Design a protein around this ligand. Structure first.
Ligand SMILES: CCCCS(=O)(=O)Nc1ccc2cnn(C)c2c1
Ligand SMILES: CCCCS(=O)(=O)Nc1ccc2cnn(C)c2c1
Ligand SMILES: CCCCS(=O)(=O)Nc1ccc2cnn(C)c2c1
Ligand SMILES: CCCCS(=O)(=O)Nc1ccc2cnn(C)c2c1
Ligand code: NA
Ligand code: NA
Lengths: 414, 414
């Protein structure tokens, strides 16, 4: 049975990464800030907080707003997530040395949680105001959730598939999983993959708050996101988008690209348990980790590091602790980046996949912020206080999305 | 290099199908009507046609509306596409003999074009009216585009992955492609797959009409959808949803299920050409057909039948004729079901995949309606007049979606 370790799958490497976060528009500056213990989460200055008197008054807007890079034309022809995708797509390609690749062996897979939803309301207002002919001929291509991936595939010339998986919090990780599949099955040699997501506004806060999924620790915003802490009380929004470039090792060697890590396997399972709550027993989520190991050719003892999904909801962190144990990975050093960067839904799995790559590259795990009184019922080796330098050889990034979608990505040091 | 023909991939069969269309809620009755030359497309009786004086006054509502099967509870807890998914999911399972399968080897892949979009506007109205606490705690799970797939996976107990690809008109075909991948890569033994889509309303008509993508032949609704006809003038909406059950041949034999056809291979490519127009040269779209043949282990000469994407836009049918030629399949007998059933976007590839199965099962192709003066620049063997009974051994179903997403599915007679 084929595996990465036994050569049954081609070797696939990560050759470039890009991300915009609440800490910085530069991924290497985000990484430096994480290591320094910085948080992207602050008091929301937006007028809409006072207008609605929202329960949640904290979150992390992008440090550098996407639209500060968008002129009038882009603001009229693209939804927000398309604008963010176009921005990250060009940054990534430049960071990769702007390679000339075969378009027919080049795929794009970019997940997102929702799509161009703000253009739905706008098109509906324009039609109420002025009739059907005041809907833009660009409305369909802006609204459609595949729009961000299509923009990037068109911008970079990808003709071996342009795909958009939608699985809430796991969308950006699942995109990297399907890009890995598209390469190992032979349909592509190189792929841009990741996730983009919209900004923090009042309706998103209201919608997730009404599930009691969100922290309300407004007095101390940087202390609010507390994954695996006894005093956690839900997640915090932190805006983000992230893409990575993956390609076969032979493709990378032939064009002089230095891999940052290896992408060794990917597991996708489902809870079939509840529409928003994860299964308490963590069994299917752990099975996604196991599956990524099977495809990589690893055993649980090889896993030095787990980049947790760790949203800091009470039930989510408890389910994930069971999953890590179920997968036999609970000796691994655990990092929960949402402690610092918050939750960006459809982008966050991609962002955390980039962070996992950087952990393997630099042999260091940033501290999980606000991990001060460890939850007694959770016994994980959570990195905290200051970065932990260590000999990390293999790592799993977890993403467990609303709807019960479990994605685990197995990465290796190059 | 592995293929279905050389045993490199496990044999995968189609064991059950279900669909709701503008002709009938029963797939076998839809099939009978298609053979009899029936059209689902009629004059729209909806008040909103007069209210807005839409250019387009024709379309095919479902013969049996989804919500005539939905009580008060389902109407409050699910978006439309989730309600349609729940309806089709239960019908499919019953039609399959309600098998007991291993949940851990059971996947769901259901595409859709947009998602629970009507609940976005509703949640936003509820918040304007009564503040953030009058947004439902169910809003997130109703809005999220993965919601229909999650509903079906939860209803049927699928724990080997629940996935939602979004690729406009190719969403329902791409879902069947990823379900086939999930089985042949070893992650699952059985999968429910297909696509669901929302209903015809005024804003969707306005949005697609402003691209000049839609027929305006309101005087003769059943004559309006004219794929490959010289006098075509765009597509017609025809509501639909469709799912099929696929499983390994060994899984099917072990539980006494009679396969209706074989699912032999799937090709996914992209145009990277334009956000809504297909590439004129049809090259990448043809390459998707070729790729499905490579994975099946077939040559172009084996392809007896092509179930065309055939939307009846001027540029779309011309591009697809080039694609079929590029793929070496232009001796195949061509059917364009949108001539009778119209375009259901995210569901239509799944519906047409079911129709391809039935063509192989029954050795017959329904007539392409309204094919009366063949376009001189297109030279395809378009079935027309009355059904063509023939020895169809292998067939390709094409779906080429807005955004440049090309999916070809290779099917074989069982
Ligand atoms: C980290 C913030 C996540 C917010 S969200 O999950 O509700 N996605 C989201 C997606 C698209 C748009 C367009 N406008 N808006 C406001 C959007 C929001
Ligand atoms: C501009 C309208 C925002 C819609 S919302 O406020 O209800 N947020 C939202 C809701 C559901 C999902 C699933 N994925 N994602 C990202 C979501 C986001
Ligand atoms: C065959 C009709 C296709 C219409 S459409 O492409 O615009 N999809 C669509 C999807 C969801 C909803 C919810 N309400 N409405 C009106 C919807 C419409
Ligand atoms: C209830 C709001 C309807 C939004 S709409 O009228 O603009 N139609 C619409 C627009 C884009 C896409 C992509 N896929 N699909 C299916 C789509 C459908
Ligand atoms: Na993670
Ligand atoms: Na077709």
């Amino acid at each position: 049975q084929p595996s990465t370790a036994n050569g049954g799958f081609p070797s696939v490497v990560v050759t470039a990464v890009t991300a915009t976060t609440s800490i910085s528009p530069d991924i290497e500056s985000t990484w430096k800030g994480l290591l320094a213990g910085e948080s992207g989460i602050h008091a929301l200055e937006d007028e809409f907080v006072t207008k609605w008197d929202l329960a949640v008054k904290i979150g992390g807007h992008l440090k550098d707003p996407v639209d500060s890079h968008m002129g009038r034309l882009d603001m009229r022809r693209m939804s927000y997530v398309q604008r963010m995708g176009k921005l990250l797509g060009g940054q990534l390609w430049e960071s990769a040395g702007s390679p000339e690749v075969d378009p027919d062996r080049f795929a794009v897979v970019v997940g997102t949680g929702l799509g161009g939803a703000e253009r739905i309301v706008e098109s509906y207002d324009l039609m109420n105001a002025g009739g059907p002919r005041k809907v833009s001929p660009l409305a369909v291509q802006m609204i459609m959730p595949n729009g961000a991936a299509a923009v990037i595939g068109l911008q970079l010339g990808a003709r071996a598939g342009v795909m958009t998986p939608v699985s809430a919090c796991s969308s950006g990780s699942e995109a990297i999983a399907h890009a890995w599949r598209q390469i190992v099955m032979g349909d592509a040699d190189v792929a841009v993959c990741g996730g983009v997501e919209g900004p923090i506004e009042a309706l998103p806060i209201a919608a997730f708050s009404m599930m009691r999924a969100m922290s309300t620790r407004n007095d101390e915003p940087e202390r609010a996101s507390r994954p695996f802490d006894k005093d956690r009380d839900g997640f915090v929004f932190g805006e983000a988008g992230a893409l990575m470039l993956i390609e076969t090792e032979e493709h990378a060697k032939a064009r002089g690209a230095k891999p940052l890590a290896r992408l060794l396997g990917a597991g996708i399972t489902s809870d079939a348990f509840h529409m928003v709550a994860p299964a308490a027993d963590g069994v299917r989520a752990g099975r996604a980790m196991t599956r990524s190991l099977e495809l990589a050719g690893l055993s649980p003892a090889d896993i030095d590091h787990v980049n947790a999904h760790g949203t800091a909801t009470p039930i989510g962190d408890a389910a994930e602790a069971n999953a890590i144990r179920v997968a036999g990975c609970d000796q691994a050093a655990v990092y929960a980046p949402k402690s610092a960067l918050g939750h960006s839904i459809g982008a966050v799995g991609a962002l955390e996949s980039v962070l996992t790559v950087l952990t393997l590259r630099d042999g260091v795990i940033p501290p999980t912020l606000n991990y001060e009184t460890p939850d007694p019922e959770i016994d994980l080796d959570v990195v905290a206080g200051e970065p932990r330098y260590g000999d990390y050889r293999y790592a799993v990034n977890n993403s467990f999305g609303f709807g019960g979608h479990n994605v685990a990505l197995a990465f290796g040091r190059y």
